[PDB]
Ligand binder design. Sequence first.
Ligand code: CLA
Ligand SMILES: CC1=C(/C=C/C(C)=C/C=C/C(C)=C/C=C/C=C(C)/C=C/C=C(C)/C=C/C2=C(C)CCCC2(C)C)C(C)(C)CCC1
Ligand SMILES: CC1=C(C/C=C(\C)CCC[C@H](C)CCC[C@H](C)CCCC(C)C)C(=O)c2ccccc2C1=O
Ligand code: SF4
Ligand code: SF4
Ligand code: SF4
Ligand SMILES: [Ca+2]
Ligand SMILES: [Cl-]
Lengths: 75, 80, 749, 42, 124, 143, 170
Amino acid sequence: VVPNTVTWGPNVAIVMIICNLIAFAIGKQVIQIPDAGPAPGTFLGLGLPALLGVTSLGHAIGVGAILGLANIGVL
Amino acid sequence: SHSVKIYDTCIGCTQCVRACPTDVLEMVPWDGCRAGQIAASPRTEDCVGCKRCETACPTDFLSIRVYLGAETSRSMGLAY
Amino acid sequence: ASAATEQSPIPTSFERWAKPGHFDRTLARGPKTTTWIWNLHADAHDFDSHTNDLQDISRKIFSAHFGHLAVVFVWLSGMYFHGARFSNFSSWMADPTHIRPSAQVVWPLVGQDILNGDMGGGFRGIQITSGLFQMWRGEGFTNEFQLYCTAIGALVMAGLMIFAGWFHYHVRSPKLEWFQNVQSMLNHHLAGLLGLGSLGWAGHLIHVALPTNKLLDAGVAPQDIPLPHEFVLDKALMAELYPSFAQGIRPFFTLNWATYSDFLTFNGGLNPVTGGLWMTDIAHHHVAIAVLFIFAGHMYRTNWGIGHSIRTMLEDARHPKMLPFLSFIGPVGHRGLFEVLTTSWHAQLSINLAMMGSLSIIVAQHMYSMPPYPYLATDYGTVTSLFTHHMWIGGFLIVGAAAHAGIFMVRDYDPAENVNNVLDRVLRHRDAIISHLVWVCQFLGFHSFAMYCHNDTMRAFGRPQDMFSDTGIQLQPIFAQWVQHIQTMAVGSTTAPGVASPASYAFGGGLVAVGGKVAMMPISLGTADFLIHHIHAFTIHVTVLVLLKGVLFARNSRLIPDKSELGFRFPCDGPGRGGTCQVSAWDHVFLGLFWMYNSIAMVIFHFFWKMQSDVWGAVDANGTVSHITGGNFAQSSITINGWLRDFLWAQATQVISSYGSALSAYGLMFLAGHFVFAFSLMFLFSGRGYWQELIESIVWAHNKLRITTAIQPRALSITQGRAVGAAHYLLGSIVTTWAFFLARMAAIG
Amino acid sequence: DATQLEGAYAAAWLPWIMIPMITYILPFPIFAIAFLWIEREG
Amino acid sequence: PCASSPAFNERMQNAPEGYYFDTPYQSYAANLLCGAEGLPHQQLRFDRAIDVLIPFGIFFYVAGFIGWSGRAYLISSPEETEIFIDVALAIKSFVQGLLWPLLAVKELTTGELTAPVSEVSVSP
Amino acid sequence: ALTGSMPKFGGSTGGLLTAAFVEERYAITWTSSKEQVFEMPTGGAATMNEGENLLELARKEQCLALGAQLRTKFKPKITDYKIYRIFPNGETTFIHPADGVFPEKVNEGRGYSGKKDRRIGENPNPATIKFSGQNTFETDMKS
Amino acid sequence: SDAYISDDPIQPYQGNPQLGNLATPINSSNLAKAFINNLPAYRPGLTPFLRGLEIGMAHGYFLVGPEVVFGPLKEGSHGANLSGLITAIYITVSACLGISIFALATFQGDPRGTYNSHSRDRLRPLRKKEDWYQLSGGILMGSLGGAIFAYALLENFELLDSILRGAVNV
Ligand code: CLA
Ligand SMILES: CC1=C(/C=C/C(C)=C/C=C/C(C)=C/C=C/C=C(C)/C=C/C=C(C)/C=C/C2=C(C)CCCC2(C)C)C(C)(C)CCC1
Ligand SMILES: CC1=C(C/C=C(\C)CCC[C@H](C)CCC[C@H](C)CCCC(C)C)C(=O)c2ccccc2C1=O
Ligand code: SF4
Ligand code: SF4
Ligand code: SF4
Ligand SMILES: [Ca+2]
Ligand SMILES: [Cl-]
């Protein structure tokens, strides 16, 4: 009835990190990057706004991917 | 065509001529008022009948009257 | 100070109150005639005419918004106070199936306390149809003291809202650069107003409403229920109800969300006990849309580089960057539209009114079929009133959208600003738009209404095999029937395995009956439904024709090439060119008000008759449903005579036979609406010169008695006579339908 | 009883032909004659 | 009469009492004239002469009061006194408006209630 | 025969129709000091070229609406526009300004064409011109 | 600035921006023009009688069907086909009487509107009254024939059905 969904184990932290790094890989190709604010470009290219946006999209992708993989047995 | 008549109570203020959208009216010398001008309506074949000239007239009663007459394709304002 | 954007002048003076017309230069001249009195209220709020600076107008608009919010809070305070002092809310809380909601008692004056009807429980009052009781039950209210507290809070908010409007104009008013920050405004409204608002309401539901409603559905008496803060305070009491609250807020951060699947359900049906939607399913909805709206609020670049710029997105939507078949909008596209929408308040108001009216109509269509409050669907007067009210509000708002799209054209449109863009290119082929709208309105008018006339003629001939009936020439709406079948197949144990029930039982599924009466059941769509939906399409299209014609030809036409110089609200341009009466955009708003009436009246009539003959009824012990009018929509609503006999003549039995009863005020208002409708026709059919020439004789009779007045009495102007006729027609014709609906639903349930 | 139109009166075949002539046979010729009369030029 | 009317008692002895039928069905039935439907009919006879004078004659006083207050306020005026009702001149035209009955017959004979035919604008 | 570049415009549905070519067309010519956007009387926005412009319109009222826009919506004003009437045989006739000044001014030589030495309230009342053909303003006396 | 300075899909009609039309893909693409210009109303070179004949054949053919399916005689095959045939006949004779009286009223001296000698309408190429009378005669002939061809195919539908199922090869 409900889509499985596991708790949290090293397998869940891996998927949440591999999805946060894919977010960093694709978020280097944005425009108006390193937009000062705080730590203007002190996050390997990205500033603090861009790091927070990349990690927020990474968390979103991670929650979606983790719940999908937990639904279908793989996780 | 409509008939636009101008009467001797005209004071030559030009406001009827300025309000005409189709250029029916113009000013002609008169020496019948102290402005020295009176309106005239030669191109009354162009008159649509909007009566903007009558709205612009300050005299009581109006020194300009439009009498809507035989309708032509110009007085009906038809672009078709 | 915190953003360095205020320092507003306009000192709070009192002397500027005894000089009406101070806003307009000609209004502060000296009255002279009576037209000035009516001109005072014709452009009192039009801040665009008063001044010329956009920043001063924006400041005025902001403070007017605050004052409006204050007015709405006063109204909310009054409704909560009426539910806390002059209501049977506690009695209805005890028995919400046998007690009639009432929140208004009449003073014992001349014949007057007959309107106080017996509402069940010994309460003598007026049966309210606003749905306040059903709303308060769903929110979590159990006693009247909580309603009194909410009333006091709303009154305090109203005082606070009238201080924020005086402080943001007379003390520290914003600059124009603050108002033009559409990126920041969209970010905050999307994430902080909608997102955080629905998140806070989801918190309320999860901790107040879901507890109270669960105990209420279990059977607990309303004052045997704990107050909401105990539900918040101790987690043992709350874990008795839900076993997912024993793990606290831990499964959420460790992403074990199926732990929470007993108060965030995804059932998707109706509560059998109440009749309303599943409350857990509602809370899950608000959680999901909070996560969606907050995430949507991080879209527009504000001060940090990341984001979109709406100006860039607008300027890039153009050929050759479009889809190849959508490339007809040319190489400019939406280039000058960001400067249209950040400098014109009328353009924004037009869009927002169109969306607000459309969304009010969507609210009307989603709350009869998915009743979102407990014991809402079974109170048929409330369902009728809510649907009808929101349809009327939506139609009026949509007409105002066209009104302000026309005010933008005459005043705020600049040809040099927007050249060969989508706005210029629409004005540059509007004959094609309007002529195709004329043809589609004609096609729809023959293929909806003339089919009804065909049916009348065939039924009067005695040849019903030749009719457009379900027994004659069938016109089944196969596409909507197929959508209904897809909606009931989707929810199987498919394409939506998570949901158990159908999203509404209107599509299919089963029958929800509460207290004997039907809450919801499948709405079968036959030939009568095909015919009435094409009536709806036709009327909406002619309304669009009337309104769009005035918007598109507000600047100029082939008849009057300088119509923008004449204004937005002018009567005519004389009897020439054949007679140019009602050529303004305002006169098109005038003529579209009638067409919105004619469109929304048929929608509310379709709803009333179809729901009353094919949904609402009385389930017996076995399960047989005896509908209110008896399933006569499928055979009587296909002729005009059956609409006049089986709907208007038959269902107005309760409003004209109401004299001497407690519904007698409805009969009085039925007759009053007929009076005001007929009285409107004096202003609509007659013209101004007759009345001015009759006032001449009346002024002569006054001069003879030496009762002459300084303010010279003049007839109402041409557009004012039109506005008065339209207002009277709409008021009387809507009061009539209101009395008819409400007397009918308060007598046969 | 009445499966079709009848006439219980003298020359009852006359409605049968008179209603077509007056109502949908001769009218469009009359409309054409009147249209040609109102659209003829001087 | 309403007291002896045989049809007027079927609305007497079967009706809500309240305070709109109990202290109103009496004084009414004592001094009215009902027909055959049990309904008071307003008659115009010699007995009504001292009955219909209190609606007819006492309305004439208050109507003439309003019409003479609207006159005496408006002769002493000038397009701002109609917008902003001058309360002092309003009280001055109310005090004189009380005894307007006398003032009205003190205007017709003096010829200052009616205007001349050549001092009032007309039309063609 | 008429000099001027057509203004830069994408076309519209509000332009010339059959009656333009079977009854009459009008043309307006004007000189602009710069290339700039004006509003077409037919709907839309066109761009006038620097120098001499020539535009064909369907009505004289459209040509006069454009001319009123030229001399009021632009700084510096465009007051040198000329309006011509074009006939189906090609014949062009200079109509505005009829004289060569501008009707709003007063030129010595124009001549009376609507003047009736009366005072309106003294036309011959219609009981006397019944079966005559004249109607009450196309007369000569004063009663 | 941008008013006809960029090259867009929508052009002025015939390169003239002061004409009351636009060159859109529906009136100016090669597919739309290839279809419309080769319809009998517009096909180059045809005599008006042959234009009208083909227009009528196509028209009288489909005009039989609506009354065959939906008419008062639809409960029986023979009467339904006859009601459709006479409906097509009546609509044809009315439409051709209209074509004849249009030509009679329009072409009086130099006509007014699109049939004036100075007219530039490309969409109305029958400039003479002789074209209109030949068209009326052709539309009448073709439409009455196409109507009775549809009637004859519907009357013999039992035979045409047994033929197209090979039931005649026994
Ligand atoms: C019942 C009254 C009535 C009727 C029949 C109409 C009909 C029409 N209105 Mg209208 N209107 C009305 C009341 C009515 N209005 C009122 C009360 C107002 C007050 C504000 C308006 C204001 C209004 C506006 C502003 C507009 C219309 C428009 C239209 C036309 C819509 C197009 C269409 O439906 O094609 C179908 C035609 C009909 C439905 C008419 C009846 C046809 C019958 C059923 C068939 C007749 C059979 C056969 C031909 C008879 C031949 C017999 C022979 C002897 C002659 C249409 C002719 C709009 C328009 O022009 O659309 C393009 C337009 O913009 N109306
Ligand atoms: C647009 C289009 C379309 C449509 C089309 C259509 C519309 C159709 C049709 C059709 C039709 C509508 C056809 C028809 C036809 C016909 C015919 C084929 C005819 C005939 C005939 C005949 C053969 C006759 C004969 C005769 C005569 C003449 C004489 C004597 C008698 C007889 C009979 C012998 C589509 C989309 C699809 C695609 C393409 C394009
Ligand atoms: C009746 C009518 C009038 C006449 C209506 C008028 C003059 C308005 C009526 C309002 C009255 C005159 C109220 C004003 C009276 C004063 C305000 C005094 C009222 C007393 C209170 C202060 C108690 C028009 O002017 C008109 C114009 C165009 C189309 C149709 C019509 C039309 O039908
Ligand atoms: S009626 Fe109009 S067009 Fe005729 S002269 Fe007067 S203003 Fe000019
Ligand atoms: S507006 Fe009247 S007064 Fe002035 S010039 Fe024209 S006719 Fe004479
Ligand atoms: S009738 Fe009235 S609205 Fe029409 S043209 Fe004359 S004055 Fe204008
Ligand atoms: Ca039959
Ligand atoms: Cl019927």
